[PDB]
Structure formats: C-alpha cells, structure tokens
Amino acid sequence: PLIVPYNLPLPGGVVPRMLITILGTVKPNANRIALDFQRGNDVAFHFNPRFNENNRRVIVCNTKLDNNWGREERQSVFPFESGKPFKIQVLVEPDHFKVAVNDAHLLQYNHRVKKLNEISKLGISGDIDLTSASYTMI
C-alpha cells in the first residue's frame, strides 16, 4: 500500500481530459477523508468527506487562497462507508472538476483557480488505507 498522507505530483499541472483515480479502503470509525489539489500553498480544490459533522455525513468542497478558505460547497449525497473499499475518480473538464465515486457521478466543482497548469500536486489524507493513486489521459 501507500503511506498516508500521500503526495501525488501532477507534472505540468492538470489539463482537461486528465483522469485521477484514487483507490483505498475507509478505516473503521473514520472521521474524514481529504483530497487537496494544490497550486503551491493554495488549494485549488479541496474535496473533504466528513463522517460526523454534528451527527451528519457531508462532503465539503472549497478553495484556499493566501491561507484563507472561501465559500464552501456542500454535498449531502455521501457514497463512502466506514470499513469499505472505494474508488474516487476526478476528471478534469474545461470548467470544473467532475467527481465520481464507485463509478457513480457525485459532484462537480467549478474552477476557481484558473491556472490549471500550476495545480501540480494532489495531497491525499485522512482515515483511509490507500491502495493506489494514479492518473491517465482519456
């Protein structure tokens, strides 16, 4: 397996038609997962499943610029389960990141950071066993 937190370099940043695939298993009694697509210290796209926010399960998405979080985009559809294997696919499209979990469309996130070619790292963290992290062009 891979060590968590895991840094996946994205050479030359992201580009439409780039597909990032993360395979892992959620730990029992998990609290959180996070994917952080970074542009240096900025987080272009933070994708953050929360297993217990006031006894609710929610996915929080956001952008961090100059160390400040912006407006949260929340998704109540929650395909993850403690103890279970998952696949997250993030497809870069011209105007948004498109996320599918276990082959089912989950959400889209409009590009706030527009210099796609400078989003050159993906951090993967949280309460998971990480099996694989890779990318390909479709």
Ligand SMILES: OC[C@H]1O[C@@H](O[C@H]2[C@H](O)[C@@H](O)[C@H](O)O[C@@H]2CO)[C@H](O)[C@@H](O)[C@H]1O
């Ligand atoms: O927005 C992503 C960011 O959220 C931080 O937590 C927020 C929390 O979601 C919000 O309800 C409250 O008003 O402010 C907190 C601090 O900004 C997390 O700390 C951070 O890790 C990100 O997940």
Ligand SMILES: [Cl-]
């Ligand atoms: Cl930008």
